[PDB]
């Protein structure tokens, strides 16, 4: 099958910028390529077909180009609606194959996260479970690493992470990490820590608590 | 008493004969002043008119050539006589009429040419196998009717051009049946295979080497082949003195003139021969199919009897074309041509079962009428054609010619010929309107108003310019 | 106008079969090719196959040969995608696609049909309050919604009152069951001065529990 | 009656180009009238016949015309694991031309097409194609509704149903006043014949170069049939439009099928959904009844009348003999919803093989008496066989049975003078409608100007 290597995976840009998404095939496809758009939490809309032809209704600020095995999608002067996912698709050969995708994200100034740790609730402990929650809210850029430590030692089993899309107001990202243990195992230890590694600080942002102690 | 000859009060011998075929003119000098010179021949002699001075032509009809009808068409270098008499002299005075007869015989043991023109598209593959002995089988049965049989063979499919022809892949051009599990010949329009010959085993062995081709559309280009088989006299080999049978076999519809435009072909058919040394029709891809009227013209010109030997699924189609091409015969062909032998024999009998008179170069002022004597001495008035005849039968026609007035040219000749026959009757007509006394007229006679007139036939006529 | 209206979200068990539909709106389904595409967050987009509804002839990616069966009924102007012997990996969003002009293009897309294959029964969530530990100018509370099935759940604070400064994170599948959490930030003078409640509704089991956040 | 046969205007194309095979009047966005001329054997780039089109400005002296350029290069697209192929060699571009608004439609009925997939193929066949041009803007578009991508094996399994591979779309053509292009395809559905219709605006907006296979959703094609009466009927050999159902909002189609029902021939009137409103059957087999169709109101009652040509009709003559001369049939439309009866008038040629009725052109009102008139071509008629065009005038009861004027060919033998005709347009703006006559055998077009009646 024809492999469609689409680059970049994502880009941080601003309104009015002129950006370019590229798509490389494993062989020549002679402009038999289409470009797609998927706005957040919605279906797909066709942008380009046969390499350069605009789909009816698409603004002219979109444009496609390229030949052989290398093609490009260009957006002159980005609009607030243009921040979405973009995919290439070849139809030179069956089966049709798609590019990995490209997400246009809003660029802004860097911002450190606001960490907050939360011990297990009384209700959950009485049921036989124990979940330590660690919120990491309003940071930029999106790249972040969370590390759970039990009595200073790293813990990787039983961690459940969740990320939000770029916020509509401040264009920041947030993360929720949840370490779930049994009640019996949660009481074998005292210290519980989540470390946040972000590019806004060489030192990891640490937040922790001690069981029983408050 | 007085009659139309006298009561008309004519002025000359020429005007007297123009009154009625019964009038006569007396050119005698010793004739009373009150006695008319234009009267019945009986009345002139009654009035002491000199018998030598009486001008009274009589319409007659005498034979010049009267060869006897031949009992056999065999032998001879075509000294066979089918029409008797062959030439007569006809004399007519103004508004008169004379009658004559003509005999026509369907002579026994007359030579026959049979050119077998065969559809060789793919559905005729079984038909080729069944006629591999037709040449000898046909020779046996035709031997009972003639001792001079010649037979030939031609074949057609359709115009070798898209869309009639498959043109992809390249293999399909060399072998149109490639996408099946067989081989067939490349497509061909029309090809002459065997010139008319009396060596009937040549027919068998050529047929055994023939094979079918394959084209795309059900109508085929047989009308292209009928035209070429008709107008390529020397190549097909039609003999001058013989019955010409063109046996056209097919199981499909046929292309007609103006169909060629679906192949980008718009040039009309020129009705000329385009089969060269390679024996293929070279204008197949550049010239349109011929029209029915153009086919009819060439078939009649070359005395070709076209036989539509077609299958039951298209017998009504060709019966309807046959009515638009007079003289054409239709027979029902089996799906493998296994019955084509009897079809040809029955068609040959049907072809020679009719005599139909035809007139050529008849002058405008002459009109003819016919009475036919077919079967056993039964006269049929107002008819110039017999039917239901057998070989060796003889019919006759009584003919009467009626001239209107007197034409300018005093000598013309026309022909009475049966359709498809070689011989004919030539009628040499002479219009006797003048008087012999006019050849000895006296211009500027001193008997006519002091040289102001001309004295001819015993009367004075106004000279030229008056 | 060309619109492709697909069926609603399906919720089935492994080993069973499901048949999605794609109804043409504003045009004849017989006009063009109709493709089916599979989308997953990790694996991305994948082409299942196509059908010409004018004749029923189909093409498939050999990866889906066996599970995917594409059909069409020109009468109801609908094209179908049947999936058999369902597996957890068949949990994806499925789109029907047709071209605009180019015979081979992929221009018009339906809204998509969500499919979820699971053995989980209808389980109600367990709502837990998240209060901080025993200082600053800003305070942050939380609410943990754990062990519910199927999706979705609506989470608010003080019955939609407190809306600004809230982060409700997407649900995550934890052993055939879903887990969700939400955070909220206000000033120190607001809490525990003013009561803050976590309202969680799960219409699947028809439960609307509410937990008030209490300090430690 | 009042066409000038003394001072003609001659336009000429290249030798052997068949310049004048088809023609039409063309008005630009400013109303200036030109002559579009098809030359279906014009040489292309590879020194091979591909056809061509010429747009002749109006000049009393005539002369040479500039070319209306179209892409003549064969195309190849490797898409969908298939290979699409167009073949323009001997396509006959210009075998039909028609003008509507400021757009010219020139068609190549014998453009071939094929689709390769591994070792299989669709078969290389003449689907035909039409080229559309807006000369003032340079806009170009194409329309080839019979191109497909079904492999040959499938057609065999389904007994060649809906087989459009040999359409030859553009064999005949016409455009409704609303701008709907109607193509005759006499080879459609395995030589039954079909019609393809699509708005000109949608052809332009949906076309892109290099696609080769694209959808025109607003297009409409006629239907296949299993009735053997239609087999090999060449339905769409000729086409025309008019108003025959009394509903001015609907446009009716007139279709010639000259070999319909075992070469009896037929002409049919349909609504825009290809539903049959009337059928006129041929009088005589092989006469090619339906070779040409013309629509015009000749008797001044406001109702369109129908003229059908059967150029191969054989007239009955003395001694049970037939003479191919050709014949034209006039059908007057009755008042209100009623069937077209027998012909109101039969016009029969005189010259043997002259093909009277090969072309029929509405002239508009030539002598300005209130009745529309026609010209009938006999491309091989006249006492010399060089060709004749005969003008028949309208009257309250239809047409005059004798011609008001006869135009003898000014070209040598074989010019096919009259094979193409077009009238009803005032090219010199003198208030009288004029006549253009093609003579593709001589590669020339003759313009006859109408003058005040004498
Ligand atoms: C070869 O040539 C023959 C002769 O022309 C064709 O046969 C004719 O075909 C036409 C059309 O199919 C027939 O027309 C129909 O005639 C009927 C009345 O005919 C009666 O009288 C004849 C006398 O011989 C009888 O043979 C016959 O059986 C009948 O008893 C009408 O009833 C028909 O009217 C219906 O159809 C027409 C159109 O088809 C409609 O307009 C009418 O409203 C009505 O619905 C029709 O008029 C004709 O009768 C046939 N003649 C003969 C002698 O059979 C062949 O078709 C032709 N074949 C080929 C392959 O070319
Ligand atoms: C054809 O036969 C008719 C008989 O029906 C002939 O007409 C008669 O000919 C005789 C000849 O003696 C006349 O006496 C009759 O007056 C004719 N009767 C008519 C004309 O009604 C006719 O002469 C024959 N013609 C030829 C050329 O043989
Ligand atoms: N749209 C339709 N209803 C329709 C009408 C007519 C046909 C055919 N009419 O004829 C062809 C059959 N072909 C003819 C040539 N045959 C080979 C040969 O004779 O060489 C082989 C068989 C098929 C098909 C569909
Ligand atoms: C002309 O007719 C008469 C009257 O029947 C007949 O006696 C005579 O033989 C005919 N003449 C010829 C030459 O047949
Ligand atoms: Ca109407
Ligand atoms: Ca009228
Ligand atoms: Ca007039
Ligand atoms: Ca004028
Ligand atoms: Mn055949
Ligand atoms: Mn057979
Ligand atoms: Mn054929």
Q: Which of D333, D260, D329 lies closest to D293 in space, CA to CA?
A: D329
Query: What residues are in contact with ligand 4 under a 6 Å CB criterion?
Result: B 61, 99-101
Q: How far is CA B5 from CA B9, B23, B88, B456, in A?
A: 7, 6, 31, 19
Q: Do B457 and B442 form a contact (C-beta atoms < 8 A)?
A: no
Nearest chain A residue to C111, by CA: A43
The verdict on C193 and C173 lying in the same domain is yes
Domain coordinates of chain A in residue numbers?
Answer: 4-106, 114-210
d(C-alpha A84, C-alpha A77), whole Å: 15
Burial class (CB in 10 A: 0-12, 13-18, 19+), C74: middle
D186: nearest CB among B166, B262, B321: B262
Burial D19-50 (b: 16+ CB within 10 A, else e): bbbbbbbbebeeeebbbbbbbbbbbbeeeebb
Task: Give the count of domains, chain C.
Answer: 2
Distance from the first to the final alpha carbon of chain B: 35
Tell how far CA B324 is from the center of its chain.
17
Examine the domain organization and report whether C149 and C208 are in the same domain.
Answer: yes
Find the distance separating the first CA and the last CA of chain D, reported in whole Å.
9
Q: Which residues line ligand 1 (CB under 6 A)?
A: B 316-317, 320; D 262, 285
DSSP state of B70: P
Rounded to an integer, what distance in angstroms lies between the CA atom of residue D217 and that of residue D211?
16
Ligand 3 atom closest to D192 (CA): 1
Q: Which residues are CB-contacts of D306 (< 8 A; sequence separation ≥ 6)? A: D242, D244, D254, D267, D269, D280, D293, D294, D295, D330, D331, D333, D340
Query: How would you write chain D as a 3-class SS string?
Result: CCECCCCCEEEECCCCCCCCCEEEEEECCCCCEEEEEEECCCECCCCCECEEEEEEECCCCCECCCECCCCCCCCEEEECCEEEEEECCCCCECCEEEEECCEEEEEECCCEEEEEECCEECCCECCEEEEEEECCCCEEEEECCCCCCCCHHHHHHCCCCCCCCCCCECCEEEECCCCEEEEEECCHHHHCCEEEEEEHHHHHHHCCCCCCCECCCCCEECCCCCCHHHCCCCCCCEEEEECCCCCCCCCEEEEEECCHHHHCCEEEEECCCCCEEEEEECCCCCCCCCCEEEEECCCCCCCCEEEEEECCCEEEECCCEEEECCEEEEECCCCCCCCCCCCCEEEECCCCCCCCCCEEEEEECCCCCCCCEEEEEECCCCCCCCCEEEEECEECCEECCCCCEEEECCCCCCCCCCCEEEEEECCCCCCCCEEEEEEHHHCEEEEECECCCC
Q: D254: Cβ below 6 Å to ligand 3?
A: no
> Helices (DSSP H) in B302-354: which residue ranges?
315-324, 340-351
User: Mutation test of ligand 4: which of B63, B398, B416, B425 has the most ligand atoms closer than 8 Å to its C-beta?
Assistant: B398
Atom of ligand 2 nearest to the CA of B99: 27
Phi-psi region of B189 (alpha: psi -120 to 50; beta: other; left: phi over 0): alpha
Q: Which helix (H) or strand (E) holds B374?
A: strand B366-374
User: Which residue in A49, A37, A171 sits closest to A111, CA to CA?
Assistant: A171
Instruction: State whether A94 and D78 contact (CB < 8 Å).
Output: no
Contact check, Cβ <8 Å, B257/D121:
no
- CA atoms of D60 and C45, how far apart (whole Å): 67
Alpha carbons B276 and B163: distance in angstroms, whole number: 25
Q: Provide the resolution (angstroms).
A: 2.3
Whether CATH 3.40.50.300 fits B112-352: no
Give, as one character, the DSSP assignment of residue B273.
-
CB atoms within 10 A of CB B374: 20
Q: Which residues in B251-323 belong to E strands, given as ranges?
A: 304-311
d(CA C166, CA B358): 114
Same domain, C109 and C202: no
Q: Which fold has domain A4-106?
A: Immunoglobulin-like (2.60.40)
**Cβ A44–C99 below 8 Å, yes or no?**
no
Considering C67, C84, C117, which residue would you say is the last residue of a domain? Answer: C117
Encode B25-43: b = buried (16+ Cβ within 10 Å), e = exposed: bbbbeebeeeebbbbbbeb
CATH superfamily ID and name for A114-210: Immunoglobulins (2.60.40.10)
CATH number at residue C39: 2.60.40.10
CB atoms C167 and A164 under 8 Å: yes
The set of residues, in sequence order, having a beta carbon less than 8 Å from that of B395 and lying 6+ positions away, is: B103, B104, B105, B355, B372, B373, B374, B386, B389
Q: By C-alpha distance, which of D184, D179, D28, D166 is closest to D107?
A: D184
Residue A17 CB neighbours (<10 A)? 14
- Is the same domain home to C17 and C109? yes
Is D283 labelled a binding residue? Answer: no
- Which of B349, B351, B396, B350 has its CA nearest to residue B374? B396
In 3-state terms, what secondary structure has residue B87? strand
Say how far apart CA D94 and CA D106 lie, in whole Å.
5
Query: How far is Cα D145 from Cα D216, in angstroms, rounded to an integer?
Result: 8
Phi-psi region of D399 (alpha: psi -120 to 50; beta: other; left: phi over 0): beta
Q: Which two tokens stand for residue C175?
A: 């052993």
Alpha-carbon span A47 to A53, nearest angstrom: 8
CB < 8 Å to D211, chain A = 50
Encode burial over A141-180: b for 16+ CB neighbours within 10 A, e otherwise: bbebebbbbbeeeebeeebbebebebeeeebbbbbbbbbb
Shared domain for C106 and C136, answered yes or no, is no
Helix (H) or strand (E) holding B7: helix B4-7
C27 CA to chain D: closest CA distance, Å? 8
- Residue of D297, D270, D292 lying closest to D363 (CA atoms): D297
Ligand 3 center–CA D159 separation, angstroms: 9
Q: Are residues C108 and C48 located together in one domain of the fold?
A: yes
B413 φ/ψ angles, rounded to the nearest 5 degrees: -150, 140
Q: Is residue D6 left, alpha or beta, with left meaning phi > 0 and alpha meaning psi from -120 to 50?
A: alpha
Tokens of B32: 């009373």
DSSP assignments along B165-232, one per residue: S---SHHHHH-TTTTTTS--PPP-SEEEEEEEES-HHHHHHHHHH------SSSSB-HHHHHHHHHH-
Q: Which domain holds residue C50?
A: 3-117
Return the SS3 of A50: coil
Give the C-alpha separation, C92 to C83, whole Å.
12
Instruction: List, in sequence order, the alpha helices (H) in A140-214.
Output: 183-186
**Could you please report the per-residue DSSP string of C151-173?**
S--EEEETTTTB-SSEEEPPPEE
Sign of CA dihedral B50, B55, B56, B58: positive
Q: Which atom of ligand 4 is nearest to the CA of B398?
A: 14
Distance between CA atoms of residues C29 and C53, nearest Å: 7
Task: List alpha helices for A101-162, DSSP H.
Answer: 122-127
């Amino acid at each position: 099958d024809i492999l469609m290597t689409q680059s970049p995976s994502s880009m941080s840009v601003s309104l009015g910028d002129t950006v370019s998404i590229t798509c490389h095939a494993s062989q020549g496809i002679s402009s038999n390529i289409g470009w797609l758009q998927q706005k957040p939490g919605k279906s797909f809309m066709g942008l380009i077909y046969y390499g350069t032809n605009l789909v009816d209704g698409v603004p002219s600020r979109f444009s496609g180009s390229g030949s052989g095995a290398d093609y490009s999608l260009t957006i002159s002067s980005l609009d607030s609606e243009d921040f979405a996912d973009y995919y290439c698709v070849q139809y030179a050969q069956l089966p049709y194959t798609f590019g990995g995708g490209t997400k246009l994200e809003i660029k802004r100034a860097d911002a450190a996260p606001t960490v907050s740790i939360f011990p297990p609730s009384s209700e959950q402990l009485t049921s036989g479970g124990a979940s330590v929650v660690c919120f990491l809210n309003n940071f930029y850029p999106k790249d972040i690493n969370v590390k759970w430590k039990i009595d200073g030692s790293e813990r990787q089993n039983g961690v459940l992470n969740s990320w939000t899309d770029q916020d509509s107001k401040d264009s920041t990202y947030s993360m929720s990490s949840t370490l779930t243990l049994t009640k019996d195992e949660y009481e074998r230890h005292n210290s519980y820590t989540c470390e946040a590694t972000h590019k806004t600080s060489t030192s990891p942002i640490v937040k922790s608590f001690n069981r029983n102690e408050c | 008493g007085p009659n139309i000859c006298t009561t008309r009060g004519v002025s000359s011998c020429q005007q007297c004969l123009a009154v009625s075929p019964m009038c006569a003119w007396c050119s005698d000098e010793a004739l009373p002043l009150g006695s008319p010179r234009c009267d019945l021949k009986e009345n002139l002699l009654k009035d002491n008119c000199a018998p030598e001075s009486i001008e009274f032509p009589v319409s007659e009809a005498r034979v010049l050539e009267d060869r006897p009808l031949s009992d056999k068409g065999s032998g001879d270098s075509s000294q066979v006589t089918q029409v008797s008499p062959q030439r007569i002299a006809l004399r007519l005075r103004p508004d008169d009429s004379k009658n004559f007869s003509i005999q026509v015989r369907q002579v026994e043991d007359y030579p026959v040419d049979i050119y077998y023109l065969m559809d060789l598209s793919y559905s005729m593959k079984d038909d080729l196998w069944s006629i591999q002995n037709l040449g000898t089988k046909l020779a046996t049965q035709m031997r009972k009717l003639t001792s001079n049989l010649r037979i030939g063979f031609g074949a057609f499919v359709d115009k070798p051009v898209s869309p009639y022809m498959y043109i992809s892949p390249p293999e399909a051009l060399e072998n149109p049946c490639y996408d099946m599990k067989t081989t067939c010949l490349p497509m061909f329009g029309y090809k002459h295979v065997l010139t008319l010959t009396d060596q009937v085993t040549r027919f068998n062995e050529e047929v055994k080497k023939q094979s079918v081709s394959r084209n795309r559309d059900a109508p085929e280009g047989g009308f292209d082949a009928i035209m070429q088989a008709t107008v390529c006299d020397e190549k097909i080999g039609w003999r001058n003195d013989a019955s010409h049978l063109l046996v056209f076999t097919t199981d499909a519809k046929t292309h007609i003139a103006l169909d060629g435009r679906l192949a980008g072909i718009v040039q009309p058919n020129d009705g000329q021969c385009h089969v060269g040394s390679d024996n293929h029709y070279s204008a197949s891809t550049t010239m349109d199919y011929p029209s029915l009227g153009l086919m009819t013209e060439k078939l009649s010109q070359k005395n070709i009897n076209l036989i539509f030997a077609v299958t039951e699924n298209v017998v009504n189609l060709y019966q309807n074309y046959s009515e638009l091409i007079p003289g054409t015969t239709v027979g029902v062909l089996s799906m493998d041509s296994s019955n084509v032998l009897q079809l040809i024999v029955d068609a040959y009998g049907k072809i020679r079962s009719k005599v139909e008179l035809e007139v050529r170069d008849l002058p405008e002022e002459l009109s003819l009428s016919f009475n036919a004597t077919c079967l056993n001495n039964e006269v049929i008035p107002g008819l110039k054609s017999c039917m239901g005849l057998k070989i060796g039968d003889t019919v006759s026609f009584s003919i009467e010619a009626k001239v209107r007035g007197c034409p300018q040219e005093k000598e013309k000749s026309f022909t009475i010929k049966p359709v498809g026959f070689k011989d004919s009757l030539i009628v040499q007509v002479t219009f006797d309107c003048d008087c012999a006394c006019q050849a000895q007229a006296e211009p500027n006679s001193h008997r006519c108003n002091n040289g102001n007139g001309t004295f001819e036939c015993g009367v004075c006529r106004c000279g030229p310019g008056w | 106008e060309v619109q492709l209206q697909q069926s609603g979200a399906e919720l089935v068990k492994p080993g069973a079969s499901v048949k999605l539909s794609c109804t043409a709106s504003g045009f004849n389904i017989k006009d063009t090719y109709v493709h089916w595409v599979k989308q997953r967050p990790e694996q991305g987009l994948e082409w299942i196959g196509r059908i010409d509804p004018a004749n029923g002839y189909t093409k498939y990616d050999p990866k889906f040969q066996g599970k995917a069966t594409i059909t069409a009924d020109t009468s109801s102007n609908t094209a179908y995608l049947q999936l058999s012997s369902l597996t957890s990996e068949d949990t994806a969003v499925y789109y029907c696609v047709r071209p605009l002009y180019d015979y081979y293009a992929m221009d018009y897309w339906g809204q998509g049909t969500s499919v979820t294959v699971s053995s989980a029964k209808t389980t109600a969530p367990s709502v837990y309050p998240l209060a901080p530990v025993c200082t600053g100018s800003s305070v942050t509370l939380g609410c943990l919604v754990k062990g519910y099935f199927p999706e979705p759940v609506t989470l608010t604070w003080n019955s939609g009152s407190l809306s600004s400064g809230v982060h409700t994170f997407p649900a995550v599948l934890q052993s055939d069951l879903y887990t969700l959490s939400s955070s909220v930030t206000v000033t120190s003078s607001t809490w525990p001065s003013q009561s803050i409640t976590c309202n969680v509704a799960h219409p699947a089991s028809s439960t609307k529990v509410d937990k008030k956040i209490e300090p430690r | 009656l009042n066409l000038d046969p003394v001072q003609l205007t001659f336009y000429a194309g290249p030798n052997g180009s068949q310049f004048g095979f088809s023609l039409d009047f063309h008005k630009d966005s400013h109303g200036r009238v030109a002559i579009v001329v098809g030359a279906p054997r014009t040489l292309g780039p590879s020194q091979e016949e591909t056809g061509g089109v010429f747009l002749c400005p109006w000049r009393a002296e005539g002369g040479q015309c500039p070319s209306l350029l179209f892409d003549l290069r064969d195309e190849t697209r490797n898409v969908g694991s298939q290979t699409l192929q167009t073949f323009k060699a001997r396509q006959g571009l210009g075998a039909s031309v028609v003008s509507w608004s400021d757009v010219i439609v020139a068609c190549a009925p014998w453009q071939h097409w094929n689709v390769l997939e591994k070792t299989e193929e669709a078969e290389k066949t003449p689907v035909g194609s039409c080229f559309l041009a807006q000369p003032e803007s340079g806009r170009r578009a194409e329309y080839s509704p019979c191109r497909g991508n079904t492999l040959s094996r499938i057609y065999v399994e389904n007994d060649f149903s809906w087989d459009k591979r040999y359409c030859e779309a553009g064999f005949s053509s016409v455009v409704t006043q609303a701008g709907e292009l109607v193509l005759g395809a006499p080879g459609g559905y395995y030589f039954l014949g079909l019609l393809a219709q699509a708005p000109v605006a949608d052809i332009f907006s949906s076309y892109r170069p290099g696609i080769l296979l694209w959808h025109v959703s607003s297009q409409s094609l006629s239907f296949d049939s299993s009735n053997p009466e239609y087999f090999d009927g060449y339905w769409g050999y000729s086409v025309a439009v008019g108003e025959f159902d009394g509903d001015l909002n609907t446009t009716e189609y007139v279709v010639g099928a000259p070999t319909w029902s075992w070469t009896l021939g037929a002409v049919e009137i349909l609504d825009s959904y290809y539903q049959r409103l009337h059928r006129l059957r041929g009088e005589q087999m092989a006469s090619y009844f339906g070779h040409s169709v013309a629509v015009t109101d000749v008797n001044g009652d406001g109702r369109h009348d129908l003229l059908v040509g059967a150029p191969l009709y054989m007239e009955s003559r003395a001694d049970r003999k037939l003479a191919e001369v050709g014949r034209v049939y006039l059908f007057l439309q009755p008042r209100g919803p009623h069937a077209l009866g027998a012909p109101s008038l039969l016009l029969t040629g005189t010259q043997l093989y002259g093909r009277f009725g090969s072309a029929i052109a509405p002239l508009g009102d030539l002598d300005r008496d209130g009745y529309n008139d026609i010209a009938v071509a006999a491309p091989y008629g006249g006492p010399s066989g060089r060709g004749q065009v005969l003008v028949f005038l309208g009257q309250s009861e239809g047409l005059r049975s004798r011609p008001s004027q006869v135009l003898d060919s000014p070209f040598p033998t074989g010019s096919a003078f009259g094979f193409s005709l077009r009238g009803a347009v005032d090219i010199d703006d003198n208030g009288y409608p004029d006549l253009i006559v093609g003579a593709y055998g001589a590669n020339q077009v003759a313009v006859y100007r109408a003058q005040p009646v004498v």
